[PDB]
Amino acid sequence: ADAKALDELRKPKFSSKYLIQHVSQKLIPAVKEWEKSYQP
Amino acid sequence: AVSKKEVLYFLSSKDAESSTAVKSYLKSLYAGAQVEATETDASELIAQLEKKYLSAQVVEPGVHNIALPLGESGSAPVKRYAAELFNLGAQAGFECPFIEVSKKFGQETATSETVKDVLNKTKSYVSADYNAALNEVLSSVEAEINGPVLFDGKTEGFKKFAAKAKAVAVSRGLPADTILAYCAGSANEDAADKVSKEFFTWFESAYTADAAAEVKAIEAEAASILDRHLAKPVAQIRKEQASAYASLLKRAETAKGAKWAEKYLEDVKAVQWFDASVAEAPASGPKVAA
Amino acid sequence: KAIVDALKASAGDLAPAQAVEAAYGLALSGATDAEAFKALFGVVAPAIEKAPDALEVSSLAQLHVASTISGAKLPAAVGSFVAKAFGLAADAARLKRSSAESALVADVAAATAVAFGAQYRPEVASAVASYVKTAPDGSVLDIAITKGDAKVLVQAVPSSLLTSTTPAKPLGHVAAYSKVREAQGYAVAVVPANEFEALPDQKAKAQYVLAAIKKVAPSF
Amino acid sequence: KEVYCTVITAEPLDKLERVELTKKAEKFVDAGFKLVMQEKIDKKLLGGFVIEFSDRRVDMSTAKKVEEFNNFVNKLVLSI
């Protein structure tokens, strides 16, 4: 309950870090298959 | 979890939720787990895009851990703020800002053979008051030679412009005779040391003059946000901020299963823990277990 | 020989992160005194077994250097874990590479393709993509060449690992990176950039690379 | 039964770089037609080649690859 920790109380809360991670988990595996299937 | 490339960026990082998953990954390797192979592929367009979106996961908690020195007297809170952003960029995989923006110039103008083109491809990275002050000096040299000034340098028509654009740089306030001698150096290390100490005198006066302009804009933004907010009645304020809080919780609760929205609402619970642990003992603050 | 004899008895006054950089600096300085490495690893190996997450991976990789060069063995739970933490701390030096080292490593990998014979541009660049074998601890080696079972690693050390004076010889950590791969089966040919980029043309850069491989592995 | 075309590259070609390009462009003509060649240099291309077939153009330069790379990345990040 109370008296959580220190190493997880040092977390900055409403930073992005996971909307950034949501893009890179849906941009990087979606652009890996773009240049392996790429013809002009 | 980490995908073996995020954990390599979070080794040198020092923010809390990245140091929590590294210490969880380091505890697994002690318990007989095999480290996976680092991927020997993903060509230079994909690799610099992974660097862009992995440095952004080290920068973004690190920016929120750096207190802005708003409304402080002196340069040392501004130099603390710039030094915290330097060590954040060094942990996120960036080099010095001098090395990282000069790499940006040589990347933007790899194919530009005329000096009018380097003033038109590096327009986003140089000041528009300094892009204009080098376009007027360009046309004063473009009128004399009656020809496009080429981006070669050993042409004598180049240093017709380069000795005139150096006069602009000292007019703007930056010693270009000191900056050029730092990136070229000298033979002896004793005379390279006194041009180093005159370069970093400019450099420390450059980022502190740039961090303070970033602070003086946050000071001016919060002052115009507050004076717009102090002109309302309180009942308008209480229902405008309860509407924006409710519009942003339903933005996070309609998206479920996403890692960002689950961790968003876990932080809404962690703010409510902070307000509950202060109400138990307000003279001591939040209860930290030790 | 008095600094290392001071560590034989007073290796209980040191923190476990302080005892790593003592033994790492002894293994880099060529210490044979195993009574120090018996004492210095008596600080760290209980502390890693106490909490493995306490030391950072930059300090855990210095323990894999120290337990390899003087050879003083760690526990099997610790030494297997610390060797895995050298693969992690080597890729973080490779992912966050200075990009003038990347401009150098891709230049040394090209000049080691010219030395093994490639006079055209599609046959130079087809070779440098084959030199990127994975190290056995999980890492990535940028120039890893194999002829049968004899492996030669070419390591480039730009300026950050060179001494800042006028002789400009490489610092002690490049011998750490050599002798750990050398215990993994490689013949490390170290090429410094104060010497490599002083050459005027690409085939002269190839003969300095090939002189560095023949000096280390004479069959190549 | 030839095909007149001109190839613009970034650097002057090697004799293995030419034979590697020639069988790569010979599937852009739908026969056993030997496209003869013509070499041109433009280092505004960041490596690669363009084949000016005088009716059609195939842009396999990397300067068009990195420019079509960024346009694909800038469209996913506006949707994701």
User: What are the boundaries of each domain within chain A?
Assistant: 1-40
Domain end position, chosen among C38, C64, C98: C98
C187 pairs with which residues across the strands?
C152
Contact B286 A19 (CB under 8 A): no
**Entry resolution in angstroms?**
3.2
Q: Which of C139, D49, B52 is nearest to A31 (CA)?
A: B52
CB D50 within 8 A of CB D8: yes
Task: Please indicate, yes or no, whether residues C128 and C60 belong to a single structural domain of this protein.
Answer: no
Torsion of CA B221, B224, B226, B232, to 10 degrees: -140
Torsion of CA B45, B51, B54, B56, to 10 degrees: -100
Query: Cβ atoms within 10 A of the Cβ of D58, count?
Result: 15
Tell me the three-class secondary structure of C67-87, residue by residue. Answer: HHHCCCCCCHHHHHHHHHHHH
- Expressed in angstroms, the distance from the first to the final Cα of chain A is 60
Would strands D2-3 and D39-41 be described as parallel, antiparallel, or unpaired? unpaired
Rounded-to-integer distance, Cα B187 and Cα B47, Å:
37
Residue B15 burial by CB count (10 A; 0-12/13-18/19+): exposed, middle or buried?
buried
DSSP string, chain C: --HHHHTTT-TTSS-HHHHHHHHHHHHHTT---HHHHHHHHHHHHHHHHH-TTSS-HHHHHHHHHHHHHS-PPPPHHHHHHHHHHHHHHHHHHHHT--SSSHHHHHHHHHHHHHHTT--SHHHHHHHHTTS-PBPTTS-B-SSEEEETTEEEEEEEE-STTB-SSSS--B-THHHHHHHHHHTTTEEEEEEEHHHHTTSSSHHHHHHHHHHHHHHH-TT-
Torsion angles phi and psi, residue B260, rounded to 5: -75, -35
Task: Please indicate, yes or no, whether residues C201 and C104 belong to a single structural domain of this protein.
Answer: yes
Q: Provide the edge-to-edge strand list for the sheet that holds C150-157.
A: C144-147, C150-157, C186-192
Place of tokens 């060069």: C69
Rounded-to-integer distance, Cα B208 and Cα B215, Å:
10
Torsion angles phi and psi, residue D30, rounded to 5: -95, 55
CB B62 within 8 A of CB A40: no
Q: Which of B73, D31, B8 is nearest to C87 (CA)?
A: B8
Tell me the three-class secondary structure of B141-195, residue by residue. Answer: HHHHHCCCCECCCCCHHHHHHHHHHHHHHHHHCCCHHHHHHHHHCCCCHHHHHHH
Q: Which residues contact B77 (CB under 8 A, 6 or more apart)?
A: B69
- The domain tally of chain D equals 1
Torsion angles phi and psi, residue C202, rounded to 5: -75, -35
Rounded-to-integer distance, Cα B214 and Cα B218, Å:
7
In what helix (H) or strand (E) does residue D57 lie, and over which residues does it extend? strand D57-59
Rounded-to-integer distance, Cα B286 and Cα B278, Å:
5
Rounded-to-integer distance, Cα B225 and Cα B237, Å:
13
> For chain D, what's the residue count?
80
Technique that determined the structure: cryo-EM
Task: Please indicate, yes or no, whether residues C80 and C158 belong to a single structural domain of this protein.
Answer: no
Closest Cβ opposite residue A20 in set B19, B50, B53: B53
Place of tokens 């895995």: C84
Tokens of C135: 């190290």
Question: Residue D70: inside a domain, yes or no?
Answer: no
Task: Please indicate, yes or no, whether residues C60 and C93 belong to a single structural domain of this protein.
Answer: yes
C81 pairs with which residues across the strands?
none
Rounded-to-integer distance, Cα C161 and Cα C159, Å:
5
Contact A22 D80 (CB under 8 A): yes
Task: Please indicate, yes or no, whether residues C161 and C190 belong to a single structural domain of this protein.
Answer: yes
Rounded-to-integer distance, Cα C173 and Cα C176, Å:
5
How far D17 CA sits from the closest chain C CA (Å)? 6
Closest residue, chain C, to B96 (C-alpha) = C98
Question: Residue D45: inside a domain, yes or no?
Answer: yes
Task: Please indicate, yes or no, whether residues C199 and C103 belong to a single structural domain of this protein.
Answer: yes
Tokens of B224: 């115009």
Coil/strand/helix, residue D8: strand
Contact A11 B15 (CB under 8 A): yes
C162 pairs with which residues across the strands?
C170
Rounded-to-integer distance, Cα B225 and Cα B236, Å:
15
Domain end position, chosen among C46, C65, C98: C98
Q: Which of residues 8-67 of D touch A (CB under 8 A)?
A: 58-60, 64-65
Q: Give the domain range for residue C22.
A: 1-98
Task: Please indicate, yes or no, whether residues C110 and C215 belong to a single structural domain of this protein.
Answer: yes
Task: Please indicate, yes or no, whether residues C78 and C138 belong to a single structural domain of this protein.
Answer: no
Tokens of B80: 């603390």
Place of tokens 């390009």: D21
CB D17 within 8 A of CB D49: no
Tokens of C51: 């909490």
Place of tokens 């003033």: B119
Max intra-chain CA distance, chain D: 51
Task: Please indicate, yes or no, whether residues C93 and C145 belong to a single structural domain of this protein.
Answer: no
Query: Cβ atoms within 10 A of the Cβ of A14, count?
Result: 12
Would strands D2-3 and D34-35 be described as parallel, antiparallel, or unpaired? parallel
In what helix (H) or strand (E) does residue D71 lie, and over which residues does it extend? helix D62-79
Contact D20 C121 (CB under 8 A): no
DSSP string, A1-40: -----STTTS--SS--SSHHHHHHHHHHHHHHHHHSS---
Rounded-to-integer distance, Cα B86 and Cα B83, Å:
5
Q: Which residues contact A24 (CB under 8 A, 6 or more apart)?
A: B50, B53, B54, B57
Q: Which residues contact C124 (CB under 8 A, 6 or more apart)?
A: C110, C113, C114, C118
Tokens of D70: 């960024």
Query: Cβ atoms within 10 A of the Cβ of D52, count?
Result: 16
CB D25 within 8 A of CB D57: no
Q: Give the domain range for residue D53.
A: 1-60
Rounded-to-integer distance, Cα C191 and Cα C208, Å:
8
Closest Cβ opposite residue B111 in set D44, D65, D69: D44
Asked if the C-beta of B161 comes within 8 angstroms of chain C's C-beta atoms, the answer is no
Treating both helix axes as pointing N-terminal to C-terminal, what angle do C16-28 and C173-182 enclose, rounded to 10 degrees?
Answer: 80
D49 pairs with which residues across the strands?
D9
D3 pairs with which residues across the strands?
D35
CB D73 within 8 A of CB A31: yes
Task: Please indicate, yes or no, whether residues C70 and C134 belong to a single structural domain of this protein.
Answer: no
Rounded-to-integer distance, Cα B138 and Cα B119, Å:
9
C–A contact: 3+ Cβ pairs < 8 A: no
**How open is the CA angle C143-C145-C149, to the nearest 5 degrees?**
145
Q: Which of C76, C44, C49, C35 is nearest to C62 (CA)?
A: C44
Residue B166 burial by CB count (10 A; 0-12/13-18/19+): exposed, middle or buried?
middle
Q: Which residues contact B286 (CB under 8 A, 6 or more apart)?
A: A9, B274, B277, B278
CB C209 within 8 A of CB C111: yes
Q: Which residues contact B44 (CB under 8 A, 6 or more apart)?
A: none
Place of tokens 């013509």: D38
Domain end position, chosen among C76, C98, C120: C98
Torsion angles phi and psi, residue D34, rounded to 5: -85, 105
Please report, for residues B62, B67, B165, the alpha-carbon distance to residue B84 in angstroms, rounded to integers and kept in the order given: 9, 9, 33
Q: Which of B60, B52, B45, B58 is nearest to B11 (CA)?
A: B58
DSSP B70: T
Would strands D49-52 and D6-9 be described as parallel, antiparallel, or unpaired? antiparallel
B70 CB-side CA count, 13 A: 10
Task: Please indicate, yes or no, whether residues C86 and C188 belong to a single structural domain of this protein.
Answer: no
Closest Cβ opposite residue A22 in set B42, B65, B259: B259
Asked if the C-beta of A33 comes within 8 angstroms of chain B's C-beta atoms, the answer is no
Closest Cβ opposite residue B11 in set C48, C84, C92: C92
Rounded-to-integer distance, Cα C64 and Cα C41, Å:
11
Query: Cβ atoms within 10 A of the Cβ of C31, count?
Result: 19
Q: Which residues contact C51 (CB under 8 A, 6 or more apart)?
A: none
Torsion angles phi and psi, residue C205, rounded to 5: -65, -30
Rounded-to-integer distance, Cα C68 and Cα C66, Å:
5
Torsion angles phi and psi, residue B239, rounded to 5: -95, -15
Task: Determine which of D11, D42, D44 to mutate to test the interface with B (most B C-beta atoms within 10 Å).
Answer: D44
**How open is the CA angle B101-B105-B109, to the nearest 5 degrees?**
165
Coil/strand/helix, residue D12: coil
Rounded-to-integer distance, Cα C155 and Cα B139, Å:
49
Coil/strand/helix, residue B134: helix
CB B153 within 8 A of CB B146: no
Contact B9 C98 (CB under 8 A): no
Contacts 24+ apart (CB under 8 A), B208-214: B208/B75, B208/B78, B208/B79, B208/B82, B210/B82, B211/B78, B211/B79, B211/B81, B211/B82, B211/B85, B212/B75, B212/B78
Q: Where are the alpha helices (DSSP H) in chain B?
A: 6-9, 16-30, 44-63, 76-91, 97-108, 115-121, 128-145, 156-172, 176-184, 189-229, 234-254, 259-280
Task: Determine which of A6, A8, A20, A25 to mutate to test the interface with B (most B C-beta atoms within 10 Å).
Answer: A20
- The domain tally of chain C equals 2
Task: Please indicate, yes or no, whether residues C113 and C204 belong to a single structural domain of this protein.
Answer: yes
